[PDB]
Design a binder for this molecule. Structure first.
Ligand SMILES: [Co+2]
Ligand SMILES: [Co+2]
Ligand SMILES: [Co+2]
Ligand SMILES: [Co+2]
Ligand SMILES: [Co+2]
Ligand SMILES: [Co+2]
Lengths: 465, 465, 465, 465
């Protein structure tokens, strides 16, 4: 799948954190970066495709450490039934479309931390083999110990999908997301858990995410967290994940969940600063610093948060108040940080419901969510370069892919983006994409997605042959 | 549109109620009945297709006075969202499939008293023109003064679809069912109602059904009925319907509603015997007998009603108790009765939820509903011949189509069915279809529907190209 | 129960609409007004109690044409169960306390248009006989054709009390409000309705209120009104009310309901300008003018309405937008208008839930609601004198009590209030009460209610003997 | 506090499990047992009150290891609001009434494992001091880590009290049950949990019950259990409980919860056999046998469980199926068992809702619950003597009160009951009480409760002075 190209004469930001290098040239052959250096210092035979990066900035291909290519954030409110019913038969194409939408924003690698295993496998495999366009996918499959989209984990007091849908359909959806690893694992002794997780890991996942704490925030609010498992069952899960040799992700929503994750040396802790609206103790930050563990955080911009607060939004507490303070203090301490957003490609019927306030700097809008993330983190005092490293090298490191991707270095995959303006002068300039390259192949990124499916709109009631 | 055929040597039950005529032959040319006579009295040039009816019974094509080809009854519980979301783009084909399923049951003409106008129009016109297969369709479009499937008229206290769906989708679905004739009509002065119903009737409906009473039984139960309109607004609606020259249907759920419908000389009174679990007064029945108005009734069988009562079903009061007694008394009195069922082709995911008891002699299962109706009515004392007429000639008379269909008479359309066993001996023998003929064309009815859509099952999550 | 007193030397506003008379004296003997005229012109032997009305204004005792002394507005949202459970055993005392709270605001006569018959009878009879303090009560008992507080008439989609209370208690409350005249009347033929309403009227009510339209606004919103009865059953009810010789009240929520009420010559039409957010036609206003019928209207102040609109309040449409326009146009046409508010004495636990915006110029706060009403109507262009007549003579006339009360005239009951400042200069000066007299007895109105019950607060968990 | 009496000539079942000792006499002085011996071996100076026990059986005062004197089980369905609103002001008297109803059933000591702290304190102290009648009370106060009756811990998907009640009342009720030890504890670091539980234990509780697992079965069913706290927070709680010198109780709803409780050497494990409908592993039972820890279990009888299954009751899985099998296996293994029921004195309006089947051998009906427990356990194979010990000596042992009560031994409190029939011959004969003695004082137990409060019925709407 690799091709050959040269990105010529731009200011290079290679993702290793150093001072940027002007008039630099990147040379990619057969997918891989072979030469990085000064323009005058190396030659481009004109049988070779070139991009003119003069006056422009060269960055590695962007990396999102947490997306849902079947839109999971939606399923936690309105729209789950209609979306899943509408696209049954085509989930892998929904996933490919979402990957393409991510690619349209410069993101060449996505890490999907919750999805239905079958279609995300199909889509990853098709994208890897050139059979389909889109960002490179690595996935967890399901979240261990969490129920599917029609269980309590996606209910609200006034929103209970199972009251208005067939049990059969609901069960069929819950099964394709749970894959046998749902809430019932909490009823089992450790020796019955071990084989189930061992078998699950043999199914081909790139990493494993465990629900250390509950996923009941839609039902109970933010200040009543639980643990999904006893700690010895949790340790069973963790040990089997280590046996399988894949990275360990955690889902936590309390201070004690966070500490518990830290003491398991999690490779990546998803929304680590979501802590039941209780402030993270200095001790916990000191552990993150001593152990050099990666925390993913999911912030809101000043504007989005203010809008949320202005309408008493139900998820105003997800990133607001004490969690905002957590983000600020984590930044100021210099802990290892990873970009992730829970973003997905939201159904247009649900988008059409939304006010302009809801849409402006919306954190879950796949394709723009990473721009917004970097903006929000910089609004909280993060250094623009660190913010770029967060969306580039850091997730590669956390997921153990930094030998293949995440920085522009010889031997690594030729994923690259070119920006018209300086992202270190203004982080919103990350939006100023003009070229996108994946494995040395330049992408017509403005013409993505190739075959609109979810994003096809408006919708015709009776399509005539 | 029409073809030529002859049905030979069967006992004729012609639909006019007379003594059955043995060793009879029916001859059809270009869609029209040209000869009815004794067998040995008419030659069949044997280049002409023949059906050997010896030892068999010949009936007119069956007629159902009330169906919903988009399954409305379903939308009054679980399944509306998934069903409408899954088949958006294809509603007319859902309707054609249901029409074919009706045809598979011996029904050559269906009267649809609530549906979405655009797709039922498309389907009717394509079936009429030969572009699609199915029973002949006549329709009301919407019910004047009723809300769409995501309004109060389909809610239950613990079933509120709008709480878990996008407003945009809900609104789009309510608009294609309401077509501007929803609950808001109840807020208008008469002079502003007039143009809306005038314009509605210009959209090509075959008849018009008015909500004399409410449709809130799902929300409030059976003992709290309302009137939808004032008397003078009702005067406006009725006047405009009569001026458009189409039959007037009514929806009534109370004794006063029924009386109000009788006083307007309604052409057909849908579930006339549903009257708030209050018994129909003798004077009302005597009004029905004197004005000779058609009542559609929707009974349950003994087994079904008993299952319903056993599991304390929400709609046990639809046809149970006082409504059963109403049915019995209407039968004994000999009022004019019409077969109708509110049946539709139910989504297989919803059917798969059902127990054997729910499914057995289920009244809303399109394709078997009319058999079950006749069984149920004969269980209550109806004369089998009367029941057969209720499902052939009587609907045609009520809808003013008896000049074209509903009996086997010279000049009428050549819609015919053949049974292997005597329906007058045992009404369940209506199920023993061996031949079905529509407008002279014999139908391969065991092979319907042609292109399973709703009824395609099981459903595949990811269909590979 | 009458006593003797003289109100000396104040500017008299007698309620007949004329220019106010300065230096006037009102002389009451044994409950009745015996002399009204110039101060110099008549003598007060000093064995006689006097109030010094110098520099002050003399008005008749205030009259509220619509209250609920068991707080009905509350039962339509949160708090019904706890209130009714807390005060079972003492409803007549709740009612007396509320009457006393009305008296504290200058209101000497209240008309209660929905309540539980037994306790409102007990309280009226006790207040009339001196056994208990409070405003004079006249009542309807229940609203004919409406369900009790635990039926659909007080439900909202997210508020269903019967899901969390005993059926037994709920039924017991529904019975004491319905008194057999609930929703089931809609299921009956006219000849079965007649005796039930005839019997109900023999139970001792002062007037009868009929639910011409539905009471489902909490469940369905404002733009889906129904009629409770067929018009001939409605006419049965109306005729029996005329037979009984008591005033006819109507509840309407649509233009057609309003017209229907008008064509029955209703003595008082409660919230007549509540019309499904459709504008009242000129023709309907012309009928009100030609027939000189009384309309009660329930407006909001500019401030309260703005607050409601600022928080998307669920009952923002009760008096806002088109209904505001209705009020304005009714005022500008000069139709006969009556003050009423649906106000009650709200449980303090429910008041404690409320923001300051909700409480400021709240229309349903018994004891201040009439001040607010007059303010709101004057904000809409009503003449202050007409606004005073609306809360004084007009309800007396509508309910046919103007021969006994509602104006200061010889022969009438000696109900009087004294104000410190001029209500014709600023209508909020209606708040400046300094004396209150009922049947010639001066009231220590600042010390009401005598025996706090509902208003007793805070509430002690364990009261020790 | 104590009195003097003698019980003469009965078959003694003393609570220590030995062979029953015929023609025995028990002698009590100033509340204390001083003599147990053969009849003809001890003289009764006949100025001393006597109970003729000839032909009768003498048992220790019965003991219930788990009740709720404010009826908690009720609050998990319908009735919480009405019950708490109706009796605010009088909670301690509700508690005393329930204690008296326990006493009416032969129960002289009750252990209340969830209640509101203030009123249960008041009631315990007044019963202890002679100021009120009833069983001796020992209490936990609240359940550490559980929400109050208007939190998620008492919700069902279609039962959300807070949707129809004032926030103020709900909050006030949640505060008096939680006492600051609610769900928010799960958000805290260990060092901030420590002072709260330290201070909680200083408020005078007799023991402390910890929510090891969740209390969301009403909301999520039985197969989705969680842990309330991390291991180290649980360490803090347990450490502080042990340091306060009171018994440690646990609430567990999973196998891992049960194992976690066993590993902490809990003094009593409440509904130990409720384990997510997953069978208890043999190794857990063997742990119980080796550590000899007390398990409270809450079974259903055959009839009751069968009624429950017949009507598909929400709590059929509380004691049915795998939990029944757990009970059976625990009985066969001979683990230490304690009688407890979660029973309370249920509001008569709620009882009046119930069918005969619901009421028959109902496990939560205080005053009969312990009889039903013993019946249910003997139905599962328990030895009647063992069952009797489960309801006398065993709770006293688990709560560390066996030095004072639970057997008839010299030095212990003179709590005694007399039966007319042999409970070892048929366990239902535990119902044949003829005498009840508390601390030497014979109780007029047929005359309890003294002052019906909750149980006063029917309820009068308007009580005239
Ligand atoms: Co060269
Ligand atoms: Co912007
Ligand atoms: Co059958
Ligand atoms: Co004199
Ligand atoms: Co003010
Ligand atoms: Co029994």
């Amino acid at each position: 799948m690799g091709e050959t190209i040269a990105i010529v004469g731009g200011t290079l930001i290679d993702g290793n954190g150093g001072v940027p290098v002007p008039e630099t040239t990147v040379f990619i052959e057969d997918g891989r970066i072979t030469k990085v250096g000064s323009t005058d210092q190396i030659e481009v035979h004109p049988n070779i495709r070139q991009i003119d990066a003069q006056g422009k900035w060269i960055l590695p291909g962007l990396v999102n450490g947490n997306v849902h290519l079947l839109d999971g954030i939606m399923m936690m409110g309105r729209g789950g039934i209609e979306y899943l019913a509408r696209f049954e038969g085509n989930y892998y194409k929904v996933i490919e479309e979402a990957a393409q939408i991510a690619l349209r924003g410069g993101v060449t690698t996505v890490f999907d931390t919750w999805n239905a295993l079958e279609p995300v496998t199909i889509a990853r495999d098709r994208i890897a083999s050139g059979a389909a366009e889109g960002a490179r996918i690595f996935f967890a499959g399901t979240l261990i110990g969490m129920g599917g989209p029609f269980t309590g984990d996606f209910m609200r007091p006034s929103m209970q999908a199972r009251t208005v849908m067939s049990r059969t359909f609901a069960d069929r959806m819950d099964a394709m997301f749970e894959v046998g690893m749902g809430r019932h694992l909490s009823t089992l002794p450790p020796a019955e858990v071990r084989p189930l997780i061992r078998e699950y890991l043999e199914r081909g996942v790139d990493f494993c995410k465990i629900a250390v704490t509950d996923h009941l925030v839609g039902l109970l609010g933010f200040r009543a967290p639980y643990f999904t498992f006893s700690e010895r069952v949790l340790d069973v899960l963790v040990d089997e994940v280590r046996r399988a040799g894949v990275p360990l992700l955690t889902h936590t929503t309390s201070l004690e969940g966070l500490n518990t994750a830290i003491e398991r040396d999690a490779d990546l802790m998803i929304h680590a600063t979501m802590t039941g609206q209780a402030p993270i103790p200095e001790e916990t930050i000191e552990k993150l610093l001593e152990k050099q563990l990666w925390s993913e955080v999911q912030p809101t911009t000043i504007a989005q948060q203010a809008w949320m607060d202005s309408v008493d939004h139900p998820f105003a507490d997800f990133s607001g108040r004490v969690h905002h303070e957590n983000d600020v203090r984590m930044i100021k301490a210099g802990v290892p940080l990873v970009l992730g957003t829970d973003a997905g490609c939201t159904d247009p019927d649900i988008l059409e419901d939304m006010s302009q306030g809801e849409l402006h700097e919306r954190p879950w809008t796949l394709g723009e969510d990473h721009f917004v993330w970097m903006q929000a983190m910089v609004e909280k005092g993060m250094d623009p370069m660190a913010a770029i490293l967060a969306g580039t090298a850091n997730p590669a490191k956390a997921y153990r892919k930094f030998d293949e991707l995440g920085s522009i270095d010889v031997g690594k995959l030729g994923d690259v983006v070119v920006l018209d303006q300086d992202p270190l002068a203004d982080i919103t300039n990350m939006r100023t994409l003009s070229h996108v390259v994946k494995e040395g192949r330049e992408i017509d990124f403005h013409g993505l997605p190739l075959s609109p499916l979810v994003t096809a709109y408006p919708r015709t009631a009776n399509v005539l042959d």
